[PDB]
Subunit: 270 residues, 2 copies
């Protein structure tokens, strides 16, 4: 019988399924639910369907998952809403890519950078009927490096999320894991409508903030930000003082400072 | 000769000047530059002009202060741009109402609450040619309590600001203080144009965040926020689950929750 379902995508889904098959369940005891854009081709991330092809793991639909009493269900970067009322099983887990209770919702590779954080996290939680509201099982807090793009923070979510999955899976299978209610204080949330790539950069800000407004949108597979109609592939914040409110376009880059005068190098796409 | 000038307003300016007169300098060695809002009338804060009147302290212009060699210049809630480059003296100090390098600029009773902080601070710093950018001398970080309004936060800034002034003024007079360059990382800035004090509440947020959007604008001498054209005087957030995205209007209050379902009581004026 199916004991465990992985729903989602990318190295976190693939490497977590590999760990299950090495350590916990036989191929016939596991199923995958792919994202809508998985076409079995490994690229900047591994394809869950390609892993399932090589390893003869079966696919189920979300509607089939609903009916399997006792299944352990994990969303790992899943692209569909998990409706807890629809499931017979109450063993439903999500790896949310933030330090809950902060940054519930979407685009968590963008929102902590845009909001001037120097740390993020991954949180393994129970799925309940709210958006990323369920009880925490475990959390890993880690730094946002000063020149990380959204893409760099995303790759860190994938690594630490895989780490939390492997750390907690035995206690989840044994049903010996502890879970705690999320705090109401410091709880934050961003919807799709709260993120706008086309939003003009506000230059009447610190160098840190101008740099954040650029690098939060650097994720080349999805998009790059623009300055004066040129795409930017990298932003570098220095602590060199070059004077307040500087802006100079060079052949390959922009030199920028905000209200505190620290030099930003914004590298042009070429 | 004038040894010290206090430029600014409110209890922080008046209490700091009193401390100077009791502990450091004679009335004829001090001057004030009041804010444009100072009409010499005590209200919900004391008037610096009124104190100066009663204590025979001279009012000078900013242009005069620029030409006074050796003056200690202290901005405490001053309402004009000060830039070292204009002054003969280099002894220029500001009490900024945030935990610098965060929340440079204005409306710092609003910005930390609105940006989901649980702490703020006061920072004694050197004034340079940028906005709240000069080297840090001392800092005191204190909690934002969960139901604090902008008004509660402002009164804490006045209190902790006065504390940091009295702690540091002897070493500033003796020129034995240390200063440190502000970090480039975590530096943030808000201008007058970045805050709409007619803030429209985004309800597609957590209870903590809805509560923040209300309480950040509760400062009755300036404004109260409105829900459904009704002024709000108090917001109270608890960890009681009442359901997601609740909004119930009672005669005297609103019970509200955001995406995470925690109870807010917003009390009507």
């Amino acid at each position: 019988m199916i004991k465990l379902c992985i729903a989602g995508k990318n190295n976190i889904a693939v490497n977590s399924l590999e760990y299950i098959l090495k350590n916990h369940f036989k191929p016939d005891q596991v199923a995958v639910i792919p994202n809508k854009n998985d076409f079995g081709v490994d690229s900047w991330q591994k394809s869950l369907l390609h892993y399932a092809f090589n390893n003869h793991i079966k696919v189920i639909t979300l509607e089939e998952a609903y009916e399997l009493k006792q299944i352990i269900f994990f969303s790992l970067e899943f692209d569909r809403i998990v409706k807890v009322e629809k499931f017979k099983s109450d063993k439903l887990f999500n790896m949310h890519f933030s330090a809950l209770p902060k940054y519930k919702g979407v685009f968590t590779s963008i929102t902590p950078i845009l909001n001037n954080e120097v740390e993020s996290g991954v949180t393994l939680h129970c799925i309940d009927n709210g958006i990323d509201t369920g009880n925490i099982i475990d959390q890993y807090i880690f730094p946002i490096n000063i020149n990380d793009t959204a893409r760099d923070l995303y790759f860190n979510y994938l690594s630490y999320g895989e780490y939390l999955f492997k750390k907690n899976i035995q206690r989840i299978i044994n049903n010996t894991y502890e879970n705690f209610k999320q705090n109401n204080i410091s709880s934050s949330y961003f919807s799709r409508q709260d993120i706008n790539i086309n939003h003009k950069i506000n230059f009447k800000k610190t160098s840190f903030e101008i740099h954040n407004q650029i690098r939060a949108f650097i994720f080349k597979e999805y998009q790059l930000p623009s300055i004066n109609k040129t795409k930017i592939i990298k932003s570098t914040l220095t602590n060199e003082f070059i004077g307040y409110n500087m802006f100079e376009e060079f052949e390959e880059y922009f030199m920028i400072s905000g209200i505190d005068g620290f030099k930003i190098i914004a590298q042009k796409y070429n």
